[PDB]
């Protein structure tokens, strides 16, 4: 029925703690960090990570407080509804490498030095 169908989507979508856990895994994986590395206009370096699910404002603040211990903050976290492009791309255009479905919930994190 209708309620079950929307529960499937909202149950497939991971919750805040799972989103943070997956973000930490991507930050620990060396190749993913390299793929997410971006050089800013000042010669600085920021990292962009694509993580399935969404994080609420209350736990994003908790995430930033956790990251401060590492001199990192999340300057942006945008909740997209669409396909997840690989971390080596900056754009959300659908390619043969994209994972997901057209209404998938996922977040694009921008992590910068404190």
């Amino acid at each position: 029925t209708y309620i079950e169908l929307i529960n499937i989507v909202n149950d497939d979508t991971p919750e805040d703690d799972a989103v943070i856990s997956d973000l930490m895994s991507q930050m620990n994986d060396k190749q993913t960090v390299l793929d997410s590395c971006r050089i800013n206009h000042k010669g600085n370096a920021y990292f962009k990570f694509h993580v399935k699910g969404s994080i609420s404002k209350d736990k994003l603040k908790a995430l930033n407080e956790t990251l401060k211990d590492s001199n990192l903050v999340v300057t942006d976290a945008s909740t997209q509804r669409g396909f997840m492009p690989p971390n080596k791309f900056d754009d959300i255009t659908y390619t043969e490498e994209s994972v997901g479905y057209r209404a998938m919930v996922w977040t694009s994190f921008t992590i910068e030095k404190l």
């Binding site: 945008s78 997209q80 791309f89 900056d90 754009d91 959300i92 255009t93 694009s108």
Partner: protein, 50 residues
């Protein structure tokens, strides 16, 4: 709301954030300038006509 015309039209406001990093495919696109122009105008047109 303030403004004399509020009495003869339906007050209308729309806010949309456009991130060129996510829209523009900088790796493969041959003409980045045109893609930026299209992204901005497509954002405006999509919201303005309705």
């Amino acid at each position: 709301i303030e403004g004399a015309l509020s009495a003869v039209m339906r007050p209308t406001y729309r806010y949309k954030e456009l991130d060129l990093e996510k829209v523009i495919d900088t790796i493969k696109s041959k003409d980045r300038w045109d893609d930026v122009c299209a992204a901005i105008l497509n954002c405006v047109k999509a919201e303005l006509f309705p």
